[PDB]
Amino acid sequence: RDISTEIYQAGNKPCNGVAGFNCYFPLRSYSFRPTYGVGHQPYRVVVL
Amino acid sequence: LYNLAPFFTFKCYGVSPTKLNDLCFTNVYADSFVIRGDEVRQIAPGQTG
């Protein structure tokens, strides 16, 4: 389990402080819009 | 082109950044034009103007 939110960079050193094609913010948001179908609807997942 | 120096604006949304050589595509389309340096940020989808 990892919670660090530093700028992702796989070999791109100068990304510190800036974004780009080669470096993004590591997180992204789920939409879960009501209009979205079963292929994109939010699924409660519990791995036992 | 990955290590080329004078590339200034390098911002895209589509695919994985450094793994682009590891997933394989079907066809590649290249679009070329010239725009003012002020509104280069405007080329991204989502906004208007």
R_g of chain A, CA atoms, integer Å: 16
Answer whether B17 sits within 8 Å of A19, measured CB to CB: no
C-alpha to C-alpha distance for A15 and B34, rounded to whole angstroms: 26
DSSP label at A8?
Answer: P
CA A22/CA A5 separation, integer angstroms = 16
Determination technique for this PDB entry? cryo-EM
Query: This structure's resolution (angstroms)?
Result: 3.0
| A29 token code pair | 């948001």
Q: B3-32 burial, b for 16+ CB within 10 Å, e for fewer?
A: eeeeeeeeeeeeeebeeeeeeeeeeeeeee
What is the Cα–Cα distance from A7 to A16, expressed in whole angstroms?
7
Burial class (CB in 10 A: 0-12, 13-18, 19+), A20: middle
* In chain A, residues 23-42 whose CB comes closer than 8 Å to chain B: 23-24
Interface A–B counts its CB contacts (< 8 A) at: 19
| CA contacts within 13 A on the Cβ side of B39 | 9
Please identify which residue in the block is written with the tokens 């991204």: B44
